[model samples]
Target: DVAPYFKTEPGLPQIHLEGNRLVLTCLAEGSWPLEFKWIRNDSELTTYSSEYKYIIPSLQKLDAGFYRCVVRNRMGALLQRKSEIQVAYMGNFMDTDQRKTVSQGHAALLNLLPIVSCPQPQVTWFREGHKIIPSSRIAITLENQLVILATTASDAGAYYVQAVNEKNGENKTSPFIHLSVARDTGTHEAMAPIIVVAPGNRSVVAGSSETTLECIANARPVEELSVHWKRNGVRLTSGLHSYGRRLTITNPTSADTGMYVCEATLRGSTFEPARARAFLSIIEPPYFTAEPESRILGEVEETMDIPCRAMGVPLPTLQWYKDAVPLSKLQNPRYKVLPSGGLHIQKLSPEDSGIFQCFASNEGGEVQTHTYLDVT
Candidate 1:
């Protein structure tokens, strides 16, 4: 059996920030088949075997560590490459909407925008240092805006927003907006219980494996309060509701991603019913679902096709290369490349046999596969 050897010494890639993408590639030329193993901080990490490429779809601060890739075969013990990953974070700076006071039974709106230096950070709202929960009457907008269907004197409080960046050790809080609601004594209408909704609509990166949605309903006499939740128009059955109203989603998968609605009601009251909504999208980074093999053997005058496929939210575009040079760099009737990243060779000759590569890229990052074609 032939021994396995690397074309060159593999080195570490660039450092990235949380919520970004990272890719480490290992290429080896050796026996017909080679095995791959990855070690992180001196411990083995389970990984897929396609091209020995390590891909982080959506990076988190905790993902920082020392990574190594080892390749082995029956001919020997191990051949490897090592890298250290550093994850950076953005120091939070926030801009908040002006505070306002409206008469009781009137609507209120508040907004906050956290100046982000990193890709994804956790942003939350608080009243008197306690996290505010969303309910039927409260709506959180896409830009972290807060909307209250009807404001009550009890809804008056000091409000603020917090943004935390785990990787870069940055935690920031926004300036407080002291809010007040006055009683509407001018009208002789009967009074109803008021509902304060939190975070209208929010968005967080996917692949974190866990997501928790907290929604609270603040109503006097607490005993008359009932909160219900729906996902994609259907009531959810698996979430846990406790301490007012909080929906905890464990092991959240792509299927769990959708529009979530929280409704809070003070039964037997004439108050306008309150409901809040949020949308959750699972963002999958660009990745190679099917990649070109390391080695493919063919014969002169034979036609062959090499396949390379990539998958992601923002579809990836594939480019083919020959001997480290893009196929578009040169022209020849002997070769034809497809938009799908498949390479077609017509009447292959010895000169056509060489190192071929496929580069797949999108908004996330770029990944590549190398295939050594041996023409017999």
Candidate 2:
């Protein structure tokens, strides 16, 4: 051994990696006639006993040891040094995009440490924000340089990642990144129910009309979300369909009148499950009109039947009123209410000739028609 040592427990100087792979020492530090011995816990390391000197291997978990160096002079034992070095790899810090456990909205952000030497690495994880917890709905995967999630605000925040440098086993980490999926706001609500909008009220009138509906979602990174509209619980797909947070019902007909709901779904690559729901209503105001002009032409005292009618939602009801008074003759023999939402007069007379009003009413509101008759 040519390296010199100090007397009485001259503890070994800290052994730091001077560079990425190896250490550098000057041979000039040796004292003339010096002798050195390698020992661990006071045990002589005879494995490399050629004059008591050995070059240590790469710093790793298995490289941890108590090292000592001893020098003996011709006169006596004058110098020795002993110290401990725990083998450990350098660790980097982590940054996540959110502050809380569950995200407030659609997606989350994962900030990573800029570990320059490790060119490209893959990552592993703990579900959601509960790295120490477990969940079945939670899923995770990487999309190239970014991690994507198809989840709601309720599924956001607190996910952990284990990144590894493929170059070396020593570069692996138990938990390299702590990510946070968050909302644009602190208070996040579940998605709103689906809403279907049309040009007019339900029980719509027969005509060539257009209807449009929109599905709304309250999540962030809106790109990963999908909106769907359903008719009678069946998924609605049209060849000329345009998608967004909204959907339009176009060229609607009587057949279009039924239960409609909107649904929201998330498409995740690394995240929880998809979710959806729908809301419903009708799209037209019914038609209510009179028939045969509700006018009768007849000679005085001659029997004539004057018919009056209308149309509307839930089958409209028609009531005949003569000058703001109920005509009793129209009840059965002289006048009658018909099953076809209409009125009939059996015997025509001058009193039944004045301004006559027939009112039609339904769930939405009411409508009426008036006509004057002159009995000859």
**Per-residue lDDT of 1-376 in model 2, one digit per residue for the tens?**
2222232343333443323332222121234554445556547654321254445645554345666544442212221323555443445534423343334433333444443333355555554434432121222222212223334544543445556654444453433333444545545434332222221223434453554543343333445555566666677676213344344556656556566655555555343423334332442333455454634456677664445666655666666665434455445467666677555565677665554556666654445555445567
Give the per-residue lDDT of model 1 (tens digit) for 1-376: 4445566655545458678878877777677677666777756675435367778888876788877676655433242434768777675464555566767765567767546554455668888878887665565543466666556678888778887765566788887777788877675344444445453554444456566675655553345656777877777777655533567677666777778887777776766656888676665566788877777888988998888888876688887767534678768777788877688899989887666777777654566666677788
**Best candidate, lDDT:** 1
lDDT of each model, Cα atoms only?
0.67, 0.45
lDDT of 1 at 73: 55
Distance (Å) between predicted and true CA of 272, model 2? 8.9
Model 1 residue 129 CA deviation in Å: 8.5
